[PDB]
Amino acid sequence: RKQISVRGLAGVENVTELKKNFNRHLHFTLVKDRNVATPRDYYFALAHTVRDHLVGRWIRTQQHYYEKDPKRIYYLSLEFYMGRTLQNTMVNLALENACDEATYQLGLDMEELEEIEEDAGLGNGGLGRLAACFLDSMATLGLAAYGYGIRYEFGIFNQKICGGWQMEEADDWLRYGNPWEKARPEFTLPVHFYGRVEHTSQGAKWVDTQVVLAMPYDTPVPGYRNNVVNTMRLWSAKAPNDFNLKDFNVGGYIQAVLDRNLAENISRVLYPNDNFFEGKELRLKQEYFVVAATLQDIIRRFKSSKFGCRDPVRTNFDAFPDKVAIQLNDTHPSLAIPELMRVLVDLERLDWDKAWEVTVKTCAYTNHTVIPEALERWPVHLLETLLPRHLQIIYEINQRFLNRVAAAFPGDVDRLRRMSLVEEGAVKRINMAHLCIAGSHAVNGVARIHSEILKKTIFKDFYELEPHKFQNKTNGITPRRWLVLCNPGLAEIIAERIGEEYISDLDQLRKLLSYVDDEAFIRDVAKVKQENKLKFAAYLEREYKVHINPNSLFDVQVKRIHEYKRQLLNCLHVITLYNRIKKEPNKFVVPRTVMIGGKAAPGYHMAKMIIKLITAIGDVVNHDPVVGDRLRVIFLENYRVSLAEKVIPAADLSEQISTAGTEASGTGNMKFMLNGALTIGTMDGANVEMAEEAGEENFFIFGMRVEDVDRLDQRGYNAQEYYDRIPELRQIIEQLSSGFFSPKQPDLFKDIVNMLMHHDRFKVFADYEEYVKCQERVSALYKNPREWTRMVIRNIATSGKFSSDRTIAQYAREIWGVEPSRQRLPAPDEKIP
Amino acid sequence: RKQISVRGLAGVENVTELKKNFNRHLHFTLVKDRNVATPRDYYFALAHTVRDHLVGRWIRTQQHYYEKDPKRIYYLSLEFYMGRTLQNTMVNLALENACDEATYQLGLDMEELEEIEEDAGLGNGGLGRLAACFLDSMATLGLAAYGYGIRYEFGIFNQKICGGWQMEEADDWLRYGNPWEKARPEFTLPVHFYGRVEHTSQGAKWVDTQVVLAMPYDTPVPGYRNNVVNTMRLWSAKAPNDFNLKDFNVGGYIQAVLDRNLAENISRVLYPNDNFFEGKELRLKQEYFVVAATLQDIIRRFKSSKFGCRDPVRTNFDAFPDKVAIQLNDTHPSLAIPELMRVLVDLERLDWDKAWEVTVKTCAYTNHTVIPEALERWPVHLLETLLPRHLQIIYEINQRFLNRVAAAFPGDVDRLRRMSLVEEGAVKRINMAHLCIAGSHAVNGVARIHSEILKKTIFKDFYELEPHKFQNKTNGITPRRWLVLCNPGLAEIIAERIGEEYISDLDQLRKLLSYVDDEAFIRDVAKVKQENKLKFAAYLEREYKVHINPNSLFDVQVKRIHEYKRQLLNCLHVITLYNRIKKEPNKFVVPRTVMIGGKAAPGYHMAKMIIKLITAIGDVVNHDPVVGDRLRVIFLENYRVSLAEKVIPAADLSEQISTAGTEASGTGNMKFMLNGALTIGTMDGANVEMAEEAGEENFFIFGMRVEDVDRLDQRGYNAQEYYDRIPELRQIIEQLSSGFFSPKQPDLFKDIVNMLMHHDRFKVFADYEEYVKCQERVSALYKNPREWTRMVIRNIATSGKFSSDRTIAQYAREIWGVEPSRQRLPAPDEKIP
């Protein structure tokens, strides 16, 4: 904690320049004086000074792509889980140490001020943090890339526990302002809703629509020390001045204005589910909105290219795929496909068949899950009302698609019903995943098991029609935030031995294999990890008044609360540990702090019941005198990016416990591998490529492989068989059944026990025995320090592959068709032209 | 138009400093480049550079009152009609010419950029523009004064004409931002609504209330060249994070967030009526809100005074009147009275009788009208629901008030029902005007007739109980905006002869009497007025494509459209003029451009019918070939402060035509006297003190005096008598009745004719004959140039009295108890302490 790592150069002219501009923004921007200013005021004076060092290059990077006019990548996501922006901008700009100096000289602690920034919580979990780490890597690799999303007013709710229950409240992240965005009202666009389609003369024209306006807000995304600053464009909904008021017949003037926030409700709140599908109208309107305005912004800056110079016997949209690439993050932007067809056929007047070749060559889709409840099936009755031309375009696309399928698989009548984008049943629906494979030229999974499972199970039919479309790109994590930024010490001690070229070339970590038997490296790695555990132990006791023993194994499961991720199996393990020492008190066991955190989506009653169980286990366990400090269970309240940055560097053991076949990739598992945690995990998602990368000896794999899960499903999963055969498991069911964990509330956990017993979709009891055996094996190693740290050096040295720079260099190469670069653009500036 | 008047010094180091900081805000603040920036971007770079020159003094003026701790004036208004802020700040700071230079040097036209600023339209008419000119004069006179209002999202609607009909639309003034406010989320306060009163032990406690938060936004108000910059604090409503979400039982999570803009609706839109009363709940909530949070801000900075040093055997609220003065602008903040009682008795726990002496000594009320439909009578049933403790405090105040009245006027039973703050009828109501006289120590009218009429008619009972409470302070206008700023040339030519000391000492204009027979002054005055008429003639033809003859009398009536202000009598005059030349075509008449402008409140059907008449008269008159350029009638669309600043300097004749006894003061009449217009007017409001000031020979007074209006009311106004006796008036009624003005729509004006004939509250026909005679007299003078300009020099030299600096020096002296000052505070700065 003496600090001073290579957070860059703290050099004289710059620290001078900085203190000076901090003191100018406090006075001139904040209109605050040295005697009235609080730590929030000073956080902003610094946020504003650091934003200043970035505008030069943002301007330079934007006029630069204009000039050299590359192929542009538009990554469409409904979520961007950015976390906080000050420190990361200082890391990518080389300003961390200069600003630490400058601030200590003004008498302030930088770390005090960085805690003042609220998180940009515009995401739910993995899919949104993926988008965020892709942004960082696209600018670090010099790509002309733009993230396009919604600027939600309220991000993911802030989780609160009251009596061990989750209490949700609004995330008013913008209460205090945002020093990082630049509102752009100049560039507002209209999005159309509802309406009629008239078929008049040569064309459909969508007529009688309500107009909402999409007002943009751009945030800079700086690549790591390469002077590229790209743009995240987030749309906000604005009601028009005329119809939100103007049309003549009494209703009410004041009312007509009060009803504007109704159009403005489209960007008010993030829909809060990880892996579930919400069939609500407001969600489809968010999805059309972001697609609508983004495609306008894409066509505009394509027409301004060398067509708005030579429209080459009219603007030839033929080069549209060679100038545009749009990545659909999940099916949430899938309306991009009938909308690019709507603008091209209806407005730009190309042939259906020309527009279709163009749409397919520019669109590509990333699939993020296999579980059927997460998939989007939008009821035809609401695409008909709200978007009646896009339904016609989708019925037409369906038609032409299945005409291909019939010609390829002639006579095969069940094929055709299975492939259809239009699903019959009572509610006739539209399968959006089907629309994206049909209309994209590449479809990909986020981990090699996941990509094989799509080819083999879920989109088998589609693989047999167009095998070449299906690809894989295993996920990644950005080493800048997820190593340099959250773990300045680990990055430091690596930097001493192998240099710094690895923050943008993480494969170089393999060079650390050579230090596995070097006692200097083995004590420094063990030292960083104790420093981080002591810092988190102290955060806990100050910010949250809990007190934990820093000398125990820090056992942590942090991710959204869902049944397939199996916090229940980990709770079953904690109660085994509790009971093995209550029957044999004076038996020594390796001590551990079990920390579980994550948010439940608000009406998912099972996940909300899981958080009540965990707090109930901690109520018992943490106050048993026979237990002592040997075991404490801790629920980790309001988990999100800033909390992940402090708890992942302090973990010894990482829980990655999903039923094989259910977690498509996972990325918390990589964040933890980077930071000196060992993984206990099933062979699911990217855990399989991580154990292959580090070797299975250096990993703690247990449980059913996918084969084993299918064998059991053919057979029939019967959870009673496990109740019968394992007395310890028997014992826990009756502790839950008979009120041990809910004394004055005894029947309380009756539906988690019932679900386990009769309705376990994720067959928790089946991996239990082999999981408590694998847990005996990690405590064996922990009590042998030097040998835990060598297995740790083996995981950190093998993290390479899992950087998002690799994942994006593969998207670029094999899907977008751009070559990454790392040549620092010659910014900043001084100048004006 | 060569320009260069004394708009200050354009001096070398400063113009250097300016261009430099303009170019820094364009790059760093606007994140715009010289090749991408538009006139809006450049307006903001300049707005931001000019705001910078003001923050030094704002900080200095605020720490300065802290230190010397004066008596503070809080002017509570629900309206502040500010207009645009760039130019006025440059005028009060001496930056006009330095910035004109700086901008021409960057190659831009300042006047092009000033048209980019939208108006702060937070007001309806006179009452709100009064508040605005009081703000300017309070800072020019060094008063520690704070305007407190609501920060409305949508100001007064923007008026649009479609087929001669007014079309209202939302004033999205903030669409682009506001370079002038400084949001202060740090200082957010809660306001309570609904609830119960529990009577428990020693006290009522208001319990079970919904909380809304009042988030402040401060705008600087710079005095004219004296380095004082005071604060306008405008509250915005914010929903809380907990109950706008948190309390447990299903309803909906997304819904609970979408329902926040419901609490946030309290500051969304200005209520749009000049002189009418809206009994709607949302209005009362705006009124409680602004009172609630302001009183919190007042008590806070009173406790921080030398009580938060010595609470002198507890905080003695005894000095509260000697440290606090709160001016109630109309009854719209009257809840300040039971709220100061609520905090003092309920929370601070003083005796009713001690708190009452304190409340009365700090509160004072300005009455703005006599017409009964504008008065506030809030139904008890909604003060009971929404504000149940304040109703108890008001029933108690009523009680104690009438106990005084009975003791003073013993036996006088009708007195007591007339005085009551609580009015019986079906709907039992609360007379808010009655509450303010009861609870204030000074009550005042806004013109000497108006103040005599309150003593004699409306609050006679109250004058007989407390004669000493009733005062007068005739209104005013700020010479800075309403002379220097809109008429730089007139100010210039005056400045040459008598110097500049008059912009803060307007009485010095009398020294101009000496120049009435000086031919240099007589041609320069006549020259300015033709330059202004040519500039407005050109604005008209560019911005609004109309074309008018600049050599005709510019006859203008601009104010809100209401029956008592009598745009109908002026329309009757225009049609007489039209017809006197259609019967005698080749008769020479003095040519005039009749311009009428103003907004109708949206559901006032009569005023909306008056705007359709005027446009209908222009449809006829403006296309009659026999008329030629001799007569054009023009309706002046979307009237407000920026349009008043361009049309008032270009007027020759000012219409001030209300029924005597109805316009309490008027302030457009003063703006026009300052700017070389002659007044045709009844002896109403401040027209009486203006003609007394200039002398009746130099004024065009006509019509019934108040006596004459009463004599007619006892008699009975019969409009048929005037139809019978005046053939020209006869003739116009049948032109309206028989479709001359609405050919294909012939029955169209049937209820204006019917109202004139049977229901004229403002007896238009009674002043008609004497008004068309007074109109022959102004055209006689107009065709004698040298003699119009001498009557003009007589009005401009007599404007003195009507400056708001005099009005505020009288409020200060005779009501607040502070002595004005004009000593320039030693700001700006450089420094930090």
Ligand SMILES: O=P(O)(O)O[C@H]1O[C@H](CO)[C@@H](O)[C@H](O)[C@H]1O
């Ligand atoms: O959406 P665009 O035009 O590509 O990006 C927009 O902001 C950029 C950064 O200020 C400018 O350089 C562009 O000229 C501007 O129009």
Ligand SMILES: O=P(O)(O)O[C@H]1O[C@H](CO)[C@@H](O)[C@H](O)[C@H]1O
């Ligand atoms: O939103 P979640 O569930 O955290 O994340 C979802 O997309 C992520 C990024 O592709 C994957 O790692 C997860 O396996 C998937 O379930």
Ligand SMILES: O=P(O)(O)O[C@H]1O[C@H](CO)[C@@H](O)[C@H](O)[C@H]1O
């Ligand atoms: O409401 P207050 O405290 O009187 O005014 C507030 O803004 C002023 C100008 O920045 C400061 O000087 C005060 O210290 C601050 O607390």
Ligand SMILES: O=P(O)(O)O[C@H]1O[C@H](CO)[C@@H](O)[C@H](O)[C@H]1O
């Ligand atoms: O809102 P309005 O009607 O323009 O203005 C109202 O208050 C003004 C300021 O005291 C007075 O001059 C007007 O006579 C009065 O009717």
Ligand SMILES: *Cc1c(COP(=O)(O)O)cnc(C)c1O
């Ligand atoms: C990386 C990240 C995720 C993803 O975690 P998984 O364990 O892959 O499901 C979710 N939440 C946060 C805050 C993250 O940083």
Ligand SMILES: *Cc1c(COP(=O)(O)O)cnc(C)c1O
């Ligand atoms: C001064 C002013 C008013 C007041 O006009 P009156 O003629 O007194 O009713 C109303 N509107 C605007 C825009 C003003 O400037």
